[PDB]
Structure formats: structure tokens, C-alpha cells
Amino acid sequence: SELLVNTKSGKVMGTRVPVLSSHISAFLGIPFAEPPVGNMRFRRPEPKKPWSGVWNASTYPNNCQQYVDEQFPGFSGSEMWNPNREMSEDCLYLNIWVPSPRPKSTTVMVWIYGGGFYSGSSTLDVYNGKYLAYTEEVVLVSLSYRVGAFGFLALHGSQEAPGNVGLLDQRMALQWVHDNIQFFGGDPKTVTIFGESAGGASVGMHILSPGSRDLFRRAILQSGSPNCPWASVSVAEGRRRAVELGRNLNCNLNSDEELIHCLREKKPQELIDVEWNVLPFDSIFRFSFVPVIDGEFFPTSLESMLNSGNFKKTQILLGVNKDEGSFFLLYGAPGFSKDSESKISREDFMSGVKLSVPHANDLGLDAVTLQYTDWMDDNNGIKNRDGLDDIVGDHNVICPLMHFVNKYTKFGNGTYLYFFNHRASNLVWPEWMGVIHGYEIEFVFGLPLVKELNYTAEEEALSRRIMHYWATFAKTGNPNEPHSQESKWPLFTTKEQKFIDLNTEPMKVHQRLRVQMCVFWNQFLPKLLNAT
């Protein structure tokens, strides 16, 4: 029986899942940490104490306690990223899609979801890995981690809640794969972690973190990098937020031991209802509880780690989507609506960029205003929303990642960089949002191969191109088959900075992605504010 598999903790039984007129195996809801209930809340993950019997592993597990988006009640474009199982703090489980017949020792891809470190589920329809595992004969693994206060409350010096704890659940999931994937036909020597958004940030931090280097082989980062402004906070302010969350819910603040005991016999929606207020009095693409730079999970600041090359040297394949900031305007900024062109006055474009660069002084606001403004045309309603949506995209992902890539490439054994700019044919979201972040995921997981989903034939063609790039990268460390006649995706070299477009057309090679905007974001603006 290929659906019964005896793991280092106990026996497991999956289920025969159908996929494209064929079937493949699925083991869903397998637990990798002891559930973090009660006193365990906020603590480092403990590995799952072994269990007797057969673990019915044929359903999806629960999701983690997290905010639930209700800006657009019953709107498929937004519900699709919300929890689809029940929520529980007993949520640390991983899923596995094995081909069948079961491979003897094959490549393993581990997916890490995004959701801003405040949300995310391993069980979304759009992360359902049966199509990629079967179509590409890889062993696919979805993991899950604590988010919000539950995984990222930081009180440095305390070991009852040290911070970066949600990152350690992904490491323990990772070590679980390194200990057990071999019995599902996985090769632990060829594990590929790959995430999107906060997932792609987490991949990059395992790249950085010494404790996680040896649990995976390569790395794929989509639309996210470890040095994104929103993906980390320094230890001080990290405490600060933990302690304003106390003031926000009538806690004791003469200690850490009771500031904490104060935050455990809460039930969980109580902390999510108030998760959102402790920020520097503005959101627009900043989230409550996120990884901390703690001198342990991260030995140093990230800038000096990438400077010294203090990280895992390997191959990475990474990229962004074109329009990475439309979601955050839509849900925050003035005069962005799902049901207008969201053309935008100049007056509310200025207030855009004051939101969009949280920290900026008076002179920083004037800089950023000046590089995104067509001063022959300053109340042009479209160029102004297009402009400001580029500020949030450029500043929060695209240019942060291009920093990561230029610094990385100087040390690793290969980089591949993509620019994903295909607006999907069935996208429920408004046109003006362009190629939103998140809607290349549906192509990585072969969803266009399901024809009841009314994708075009050229999008089945493109998801197959992308899946083979992704899986071949996971096997060979290189997106392309050699011995091949298709157009080759050039290595990103520290000199020429080549990259590719991913879309329905035959492929193209561009040099230096978004240089002009990223010279301003990464080299010149940092110096303007450093300046007294």
C-alpha cells in the first residue's frame, strides 16, 4: 500500500486524489510540531511527540488564527486568499503530494505561503499542489506557520516569547521534511523552498539564517525578499509593539512575565481584533507583527550579512510581478476603488506618497514626489494613480528585491531573475490594478491546465513553461534543459544583470530591471534621510 507510510513519529495514511484524468497520492494534515496551545502560545515550536496507530491524513488541516479580510464580502477575488478550513491554534501541519507510482528518490519543492506574516493558509485552492506534483513528477510540500501575535510577538531577552518564532515553525517543518521526506520518495538532498510575498521573504531569511541553511538546497523567491521594509523590524521597536499591544488590552507593563501571562488566557480573536493599532500610526503596506532582527535567528543586520556574503551560497530563481502595489492602495489609500478607474487628483497623490514612505521627513517627500511626477501633466488623473501605484510597488518589493539580487549574485552559484507581467484573462479584479501580486501563483500551480476554469490555451502553454522552469530549476539548479532547442533563460550576472519576461509570448531578455527607480530607492534616498 503506497498510501500508508511510516514516519519518524508514527504511521500516516493519505488518499487517492484525481488530477487531469489521472490520479496521484496526497497526505494532508500531517503534524510536524506539538500543538502550541495554552502556555505553549508564543514559544518556540517543539517537535511532535510520536503517536500510536494510523493518523487519518486524508483531509486538509486547520488554518491558523489570523485576521479575515472582509473588505469585499463574497467577492471571489478576495475570498480566495481567506481561510477555507476552520481556524485553530493547533495549526502546524504540512501537506504532501507524491506522484504515483511513488518515485524512488525525486526532487522536493516546499511551498511557504505569504499573507504579510499576519495571514496565510496552506490549504487554499490556489496552493493545491496536485497539478505541479503530477505534471512535473516532483514531491510537493505545503507547510504552515503561526502568524500575527501568535508567531511574531517579540520580547527580546524573554524565552517565553523570543520573536521570529513563526520562522522557526517553518524550520521545524523543514527539518521534518529533512527527516522524513525520504519515505515519501523525496530526496532530502534536493529540497527547494519557494514562497511568494511573505513566503519569498521567508525563503530569503532561511538563506540568511545560519540555523536554517542546511535544511534546503536551493531557493525560489517570488515578489518578496528578506530586506523588504515591511518584512522585519529591529529589536527595540519590536518590543515596543508588543508593549503597546498590552496597553491596548489592559495588561500589566511592569514586567515581561506578566505582560505575557497577560496575553495567553486571552482567546485568540481578542488579539486579532486589536492586532492592527500598534503601528507607527499609518499602514499602507506595513503589518503588525513581523520577523525581528534579534542577533540569534539573524546574527547581524541583513545589510551587513549580504555585504559580507554571510549567507548560504547556492542558486536562486526570483522575480516580481509588474504591479505590486495595487492591493495596498485599493485597501488603504484615498480614492482607490474596486469599481472606478481610481483616477486621482494631485492633492491626493501627495497624500499618497506621505502614506507610501512612512518614515520620510519633509525633504524625502519632495524627492519621491519629483521622480514619479510628469510636471508637464501633474493633474493627469491616470499618470497620478499609475505613478503612485508604482511608488508603493517600487519601494516595497521591486527595488528591495533588486538590492537582494545584486548583493547575492556576487557570492552564490547562480541567479535567475524574471519579470512577470501577464494580466490573466479571467481576472476578477479591475484592469487598473494590472498584474497584481499573487496572480502568478495560479500559474506556478498549473491551475490553467484545468479547463473548467476558462483560462485560454496560451495560459496553459505559459503555466507549463513556468512549471518546467520551476521544477527543472528544483532538480538541476538551472531553469533550462540542456540538450534543448527552446530559447534559453540567461544567468543573471553581476555585470550585465540580464533577466526575462514571463508571459504568453515567446521570451525576451532585458538588462537591469528598473535601474533608474532603484538607484533612487536603494542608493540615493537612504542617503538623503541619513543626512541631518
Added chain:
Amino acid sequence: SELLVNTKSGKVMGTRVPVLSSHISAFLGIPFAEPPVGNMRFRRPEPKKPWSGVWNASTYPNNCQQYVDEQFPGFSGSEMWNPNREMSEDCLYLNIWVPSPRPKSTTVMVWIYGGGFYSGSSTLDVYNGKYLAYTEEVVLVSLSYRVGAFGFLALHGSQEAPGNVGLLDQRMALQWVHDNIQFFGGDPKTVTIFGESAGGASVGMHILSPGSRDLFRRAILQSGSPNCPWASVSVAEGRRRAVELGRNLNCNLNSDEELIHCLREKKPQELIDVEWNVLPFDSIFRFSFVPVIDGEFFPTSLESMLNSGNFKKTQILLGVNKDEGSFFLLYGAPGFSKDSESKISREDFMSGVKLSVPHANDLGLDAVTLQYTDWMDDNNGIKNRDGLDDIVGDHNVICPLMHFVNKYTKFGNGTYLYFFNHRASNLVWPEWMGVIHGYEIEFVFGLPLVKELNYTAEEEALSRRIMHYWATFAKTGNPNEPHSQESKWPLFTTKEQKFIDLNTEPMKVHQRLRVQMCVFWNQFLPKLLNAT
């Protein structure tokens, strides 16, 4: 007789000269002031004392002591701006061109020369007014002023060397025109001052100066403006270049009366030989002794004058050439040469930007650079050479002028704005220099009207078109004839900001001349350095 004219200072007998198969009458080298020699060096002008007997005004006067340019001995492209008569401290003369028959209270146009306040001559061949006098039936005067230390050495607080005496020389000549032009057929109530570069900034400063405002009626500014960064210094810097002048010539510096005494025994070229040594910085496009913000000629700072509206309110007609920067780059910047295409290496580019913005700190240069560079193509000799021509042009001429235009227009009674971008077809300079600043002047004085200078038949029509714009501007305050016939030159209005091309192509209208760069140069960088 006709050439015998009796002035408020005595009789002048001028000469009858040929102009384009016809003849008009010139009065050359009339003295409007007493020789500024001996103990009267650095002293304010004195009115020329009346002369008994006739003044033989048949030949051009002397030229004021200058630095003479000699990078290219023999090169007509440079020689045409060197003094073409004996140099002498006794040099305050003005020349008058009178059409024939002598008219009856007709329009007066006074010309002030440029030369960076260190040079210039009324006697050059491109300032020969006989063509404009003749074809537009106006009276053309060209004045003169002491240049360099002789005109602008300033120890504010002494009355022996107060500074701006060189501007007082121009005013003294304006007063001469106000008191005697009627006796040549001129109308003292319809006097137009105009000038190029430092001559243009000078008409700008008579607009500001309350002691000058009643001596003329309108004003034409060519490629210069009072607020230009090379056009003024403070009482404190002017003093300190005065004392360093003395120090270079081992002068006693215990006081002014000692220092000023010590500097008047020196042969004139003794100052000229050390004039450039007192510039505070290695720089292109700065000159040593320039008009000072002293509190008399200029009541207060030029910005607050332009702000409160404290200036002469009338019509102005003004503009810029396409490529102001080119001249100075050839002379002072590296990689630039007269005989190659002057492709600039990136390393040589950064050298050039530090010389163009010499008062700028480290953050200020990274600002200038990031704004003029294509980072997709940063080693493209052309795009660096051309970009640097644009930095020097916009920093020093183009965007000082628009700042002046915008501020004046709130109170003035009419503004016409031109962008001169025709490169003369007989130009002897390389083409990478484009429209050299100053080579509009051939067209204002009508030199294409003579066929031996081998101009183009369409450049003749441009010069008649221009001369007529300048002349009916002088007469009526609008360069269009009310005979609603040709392309009308729109009013520059604070809202719509229209301006025009002048070239052989039929005339078109544009808006917001170089707006995107001037926002950087007038509103962003100044705020940068006031803060860093």
C-alpha cells in the same frame, strides 16, 4: 546740417555710413561719463563735464580693460568676442545709430553687452547696430561699462570702492540717453534696454533697481537674468575676493583705504593677471567680480524683491538658447575638445558635475547626477556629454530665467517667452555644441541681411522676423503687429505658460519650458542644501 547735433553736454559730429545699398548716420564714441582713472578707479561714475568745441564721433571708442581669450588664437569663433580696439581705463562711451532722414521722437533701443562681467565691448562687429537701426527705423544705442575688478570690485562700507560701480556706469549711460536722445530723434519715453547673458542679467537688475527704473520703459533679456547663480555675490564674499585680490598682489590689507590705495598704483593688467585667482572654488561658469547685494542698488535680496513685487512693472520679452552650457564645457571641463565630438567618459562626467555645481555638498551632487543620467546607459559618451551641456545650461541660465519669468509675471503687464534653437548654418564651432549661447545675436542685429557673410536665405528671413519682433516689442510692448496676420506670439500667462520656437521652420507654441528640470533646479536642490 544733420550730423551736427547739440546735446546737453556739447556738440557731437558723427559720420554718415553705408547700410545695404543705402546710408544712415552713426555717432560713435560719445562720452557719457568722466574717465574712471587715477584716484577714480573703483569709484562711481561721474557725469561727463560739458565740452566746448565739437566732439569728433566718427570712429569707435576704446574698450574697457579685460581678460582677453586665447585658447584658440586666430579662431574667428572666439576672436569675434575679444576687444577689437585699444583697451583703456578711459572707456565709458556710447554709440548711437540714427536712421536717415533723422526721425521725430522715435523708438529707442539701448544694448548692454555680456561677457560675464569680466569682459565685453560695444565695438564688436555683431553689435554693429546700423542694420537694426535702418531696417526697423529705430534709434540704436549701445552703452559700455567697466568690467571685472574695475567695475565690480566691492568693499561695501567704503565709499571709495562700493561695488556695482559697473552697473552705475550703465545707469549713467541710460540717464545720458534720457536727457539727450530727443536731440537725435529718439523718444526718451519709449526706451527699450536689452542685452545677452551678463547684459541680459543687467536689464534684469535695472528692473529691480529703484534708481534705474525710470530710465527706460520696457526690457528684453537674452539668456540671462538677475537671479542667475553667477550673476551676484553677497557683501561678505565680494569683500573677501577684494582682499584676496590684494593678497595675490602683496597689498597692505590693514584697512580698505590702505588696500584700495595699494590697488590703484597697479597697472591694469596686474589685476587682470590675478583676477581669476580669487574664485572660491574650481568651477566652470563663475566669474570673480560680479554685482553685489549691497542694500543700495538692490534694496534687499533679489528673491524678496521678486516676491513682494518690488520691481518695475511693464512688459518683458525674453528667452534662452537651446545649448547654453556648451561654451563653458569646452573651456573648463575635461573630456571636452574643440576638434573631437567630445564624448565624455562617466568618470569625466562626474568631474564635470562637481565643477558645474561647485557650491554643492556630497548629497547635492548625487542629486544632480541621478537626475541627468540614464542608468540603463551610463557609459554612453554622447548621453553624458549632452547631459552635461544640459546641467550647465539649466543650472546657470535656463532655470534661473524661468524662476524670474514666473515671479515677474504675477505683477508685470506682459511677458513674451522664446526658446532660440536654430544653429547658424555658417557656424564655425563644432556641432556637438549645438546652439551656442550668443549666436542668437547675429540674428537680432540683422547680420544675415548682408550677403557677403554667406548666410542662408532662410536665416535672413529669420533675422528680419526677429528684428521686427524686437522692434515692435520696443514700440508697442507686443512683438506682434495688430494687423492680425501671421503666427501670433502668445502671451506667457502664469497659468498656461506658453512660449515659442524661433527658427526657420514655421513658428509653433509650447508650454512649460523645461518644467521637469527647473522644479529640480528652482525648488528641490535649494531646499536640499538649506537642509544639508
